[PDB]
Amino acid sequence: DTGLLSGSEERVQVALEELQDLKGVWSELSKVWEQIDQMKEQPWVSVQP
C-alpha cells in the first residue's frame, strides 16, 4: 500500500466529464450537420428565402 496517484484519478474524472460534454456536443453538431446537408442537397433555387 502506498500513496495513490490522485493526479491519475483527477485525469480520469476530467476525461469523463469532458467526454460527456463532447458527446453532447457531437450529438448537437451531428444534428446541425444532417439538417444543413439535407437543406443543401436541394438546389433551393425557387424556395423562398
Next chain:
Amino acid sequence: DTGLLSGSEERVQVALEELQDLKGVWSELSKVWEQIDQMKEQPWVSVQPRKLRQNLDALLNQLKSFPARLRQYASYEFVQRLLKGYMKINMLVIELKSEALKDRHWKQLMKRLHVNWVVSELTLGQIWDVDLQKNEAIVKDVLLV
C-alpha cells in the same frame, strides 16, 4: 321494470364501431392528402417526373391496402378515383425545366392561365390549383409555341 328499447343502444354501439372504422379511414386519408400536400407545396426545384410516378403508385398501393370495410367506403372510392383521374404533372410540367421557359414565356402562360404569380416562389401548388387536365389545350399551345 322499465323495459327499455335496447335497440337504441345496439345502434349506439354499431355506430361506435363504424365511427372507429371511419376514424381509421380518415387517419389514412389524412396521411394520403398530407403526402399530397408535400407534393403540392413543392416548387418543382428537384422533383423528377419519374418521382411523380413513384409518389402516385406509392399512394395507390398504400390506399389499396385498405381492409374490405375500409376499402368499400365512399371516401375510399373518392380518393381512388382522384388518384386515377389524376394518373399529369409528369406529362405537362416538362416545360418548366426546359430551356424554352423564359420571362415573356411566363407572361404569355400567365395570360393564358389568367392567374397571377410571383417569380421568386415558383410553387407548383397554384400550378396544380390551375388544373392542367382542365387547361390542357391552352398550356399545350404554349408548349407548341
